[PDB]
Design a protein around this ligand. Structure first.
Ligand SMILES: NS(=O)(=O)c1ccc(-c2ccccc2)cc1
Ligand SMILES: [Zn+2]
Length: 257
């Protein structure tokens, strides 16, 4: 199946998922001088006070923290969105070195990593239905740069040796995703897609302008994870990012002047 190496990486994905060459693929480069300020954009509403985390999982392409989405516990609203979207999971994309790893770029600048908080539109009832709709998901993207440690990330870092290889999972209850957010919720937004297969064109992307800082020790622990399952030749889970895709007939809008 698909992955991030020479022979199964993003250049190959269109063969099994031909929407890879579609009209609203993600990620994209955010040209900040071309993105237009929209004064009609509302502030984001991030309501995570009741978030209920469940598990942390190595899925062979990232690690994921999954939440209870059977109720409106942790929801994203406002911004460019109409309706309520429930937080299902978050995961990251990162590099083998600090100068690459993010999926979106800002004036061609690459961050060391990128956090994706994945939400689905409750009017579609479940995420499987939502992925089939052009407004089915909203992914909140947050850049990571290397500098000071992010204290709200360390509980995640602490447990990664227990899910080194594909298929391993662990209890990861009582995690507060509010500890991963930057101060500002100013954002860019465009219509796009999932950045891994099935690459469905179902995502309103909301990318925050302010990155969070993480320490070199924290990102080091990401780079120690493995794509392989246990017992297979060890291939470090690094550079699990899709490069920027053609913007085509899309405009990126900014919530801030
Ligand atoms: N990297 S991402 O754009 O935030 C992403 C989120 C969810 C999914 C996904 C995969 C399978 C079923 C539902 C959602 C894929 C990519
Ligand atoms: Zn992602």
């Amino acid at each position: 199946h698909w992955g991030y190496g020479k022979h199964n990486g993003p250049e190959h994905w269109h063969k099994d998922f031909p929407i890879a060459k579609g009209e609203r693929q993600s990620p994209v480069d955010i040209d900040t001088h071309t993105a237009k300020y929209d004064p009609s954009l509302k502030p984001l509403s991030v309501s995570y006070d009741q978030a209920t985390s469940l598990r942390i999982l190595n899925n062979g392409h990232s690690f994921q923290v999954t939440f209870d989405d059977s109720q409106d516990k942790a929801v994203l609203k406002g911004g460019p969105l109409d309706g309520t979207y429930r937080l299902l999971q978050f995961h990251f994309h990162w590099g083998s070195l600090d100068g690459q790893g993010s999926e979106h770029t800002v004036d061609k600048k690459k961050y060391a990593a990128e956090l994706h908080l994945v939400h689905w539109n409750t009017k579609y009832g479940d995420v499987g239905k939502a992925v089939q709709q052009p407004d089915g998901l909203a992914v909140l993207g947050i850049f990571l740069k290397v500098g000071s440690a992010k204290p709200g990330l360390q509980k995640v870092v602490d447990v990664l040796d227990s899910i080194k290889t594909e298929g391993k999972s662990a209890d990861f209850t009582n995690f507060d995703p509010r500890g991963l957010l930057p101060e500002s919720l100013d954002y860019w937004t465009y219509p796009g897609s999932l950045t891994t297969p099935p690459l469905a064109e179902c995502v309103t992307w909301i990318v925050l302008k302010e990155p969070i800082s993480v320490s070199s020790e924290q990102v080091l622990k990401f780079r120690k994870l493995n794509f392989n399952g246990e017992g297979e030749p060890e291939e470090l889970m690094v550079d699990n990012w899709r490069p920027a895709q053609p913007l085509k007939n899309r405009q990126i809008k900014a919530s801030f002047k």
